Amino acid sequence: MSKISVTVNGRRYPWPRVPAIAVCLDGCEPAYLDAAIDAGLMPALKRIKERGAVRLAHSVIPSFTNPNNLSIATGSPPAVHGICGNYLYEPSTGEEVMMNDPKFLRAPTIFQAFYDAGARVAVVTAKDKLRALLGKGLRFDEGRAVCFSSEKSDKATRAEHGIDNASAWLGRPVPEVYSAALSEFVFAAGVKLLREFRPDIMYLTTTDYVQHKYAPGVPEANSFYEMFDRYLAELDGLGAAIVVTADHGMKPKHKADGSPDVIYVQDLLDEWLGKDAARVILPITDPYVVHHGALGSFATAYLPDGCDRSEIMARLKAIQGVDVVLGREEACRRFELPEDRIGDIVLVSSENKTLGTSEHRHDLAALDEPLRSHGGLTEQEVPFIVNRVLPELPNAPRLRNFDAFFYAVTAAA
């Protein structure tokens, strides 16, 4: 007998004999898990690590939420699936268009591929803007798919999500968006789906609310992972093959006085090339956000026609805190990004700095806590832990977070 598989974006996924789950712990710098385990708070993960496979993996650059979640969902980098940031910029018109509609996704998800092959598939997200992207191609007319967010759980319908009111079903209220509870709801839904829906493939993805606010080992960070471990214990006990990974890590990005350490790339370009001659794009969030949540460690810039790219790149690279400056072609090759959705140049900042646009009009500091963020090479390293024995599993840099489902189904097969 030949083995059964589903081929997605040029990769062969064996059919899972038991449920295959990947958990994306948004912003889970490996240190978070080490600290919580050391504090005695994660007995399930501690045992799972001892008996299974423990690795570090590499995220996609930019180490942001959307590109990495869609990489995990498709098993491919953004050069394939097209989601390389939260929005794209069109030099003509000067328009910034949001990249939340599934129409922007250019490759099928593993979820759709398994669904079309007759599998039962579940996808649960914390925030809703990722739900439609991750659910692209799923259908809800055969009782074989469920896709909803914690955020909009009370709005789920049979026809569009595979479930009527996931909040009522789970018996928990819709959580506050800016809370740990938004992610707890995902874990709880995942457990109930594993028990009652019995998916062949399931993805659970959280938000990095806690991780932006709290460093590894502090009480509020530890409590989040203590909470997660309870659900991990239950998922594991139910017999599923599980990969625990992250979309990206998290690092402090503040000066000694606790204020954000920012390089204002638009200001610099306005001086060298002329005001607004170039356009700096910050992929981390939506462009209308102006409250410190727009500060990440990766940026791209669209330059005026004719200007010396090579010279501008050297001027930027010379600045202490700007670690990497690459042209479109090199950046897309190295970071596996689509040329048509990236600027003329790509910038990556140092470990404890972020990239901003301008000081004129400025980006206001909202929350009190010292800035923590991601986007750079220094948040590329993430945990990759499997609750099965897998001696052949690679390690970073060869192992990618978007190998999660490949190895989850392999473990399950």
Complex with Zn ion: residue 29 or 344, whichever CB lies closer: 29
Q: CB of residue 373 vs Zn ion: minimum separation in angstroms? A: 6
Q: Which is nearer to Zn ion, 161 or 292 (CB)?
A: 292
Q: How far is the CB of 374 from Zn ion (least distance, A)?
A: 6
Which is nearest to 191 in space by CA: 121, 224, 238?
238
| Nearer residue to Zn ion within complex by CB, 69 or 167 | 69
- Rg from Cα positions in the chain: 21
Q: How far apart are CA 372 and CA 39, in angstroms?
A: 22
Inter-CA distances, 280 with 34, 62, 298, 379, 404, Å:
37, 15, 11, 21, 33
Q: Could you tell me which residues are annotated as the binding site for Zn(2+)?
A: 26, 65, 208, 212, 247-248, 374
CA angle, 48 then 24 then 329, to 5°: 125
Residue 126 and residue 203 in contact, taking contact as beta carbons nearer than 8 Å: no
Q: If DSSP codes are grouped into helix, strand and coil, which group holds residue 165?
A: coil
SS3 252: strand
Smallest distance from the beta carbon of 27 to Zn ion, in angstroms? 5
d(CA 93, CA 169) in angstroms, rounded, equals: 46
**What is the smallest separation between the CB atom of 64 and Zn ion, expressed in angstroms?**
7
- DSSP type of residue 154: G
- Per the annotation, where are the binding residues? 26, 65, 208, 212, 247-248, 374
Distance CA 341, CA 301 (A): 11
For residue 253, the one-letter residue type is K
Here the tokens at position 73 are 């969902």
Residue 65 vs 100, nearer CB to Zn ion: 65
Report d(CA 239, CA 316) in Å as an integer: 52
Q: Which is nearer to Zn ion, 104 or 298 (CB)?
A: 298
Angle between helices 219-237 and 43-51 (to 10 degrees): 60
Q: Shortest Cβ distance from residue 109 to Zn ion (Å)?
A: 18
182 or 194: CB nearest Zn ion = 182
Least separation in angstroms between CB 34 and Zn ion: 19
For the bound state, the minimum distance from the C-beta of residue 285 to Zn ion, rounded and expressed in Å, comes to 8
**Which is nearer to Zn ion, 278 or 295 (by Cβ)?**
295
Cα 53 from Cα 306, distance rounded (Å) = 52
* C-alpha span between 251 and 229 (Å, rounded): 23
Binding site for Zn ion (CB under 5 A): 26, 65, 208, 247
- CA distances 180 to 98, 132, 166, 400, Å, are 26, 22, 18, 26
Looking at beta carbons, which residue is closest to Zn ion?
A: 65
Q: Are 87 and 98 in contact (CB under 8 A)?
A: yes
**Residue 32 beta carbon to Zn ion: minimum distance, rounded to whole angstroms:** 13
* Nearest to Zn ion of 119, 295 (CB atom): 295
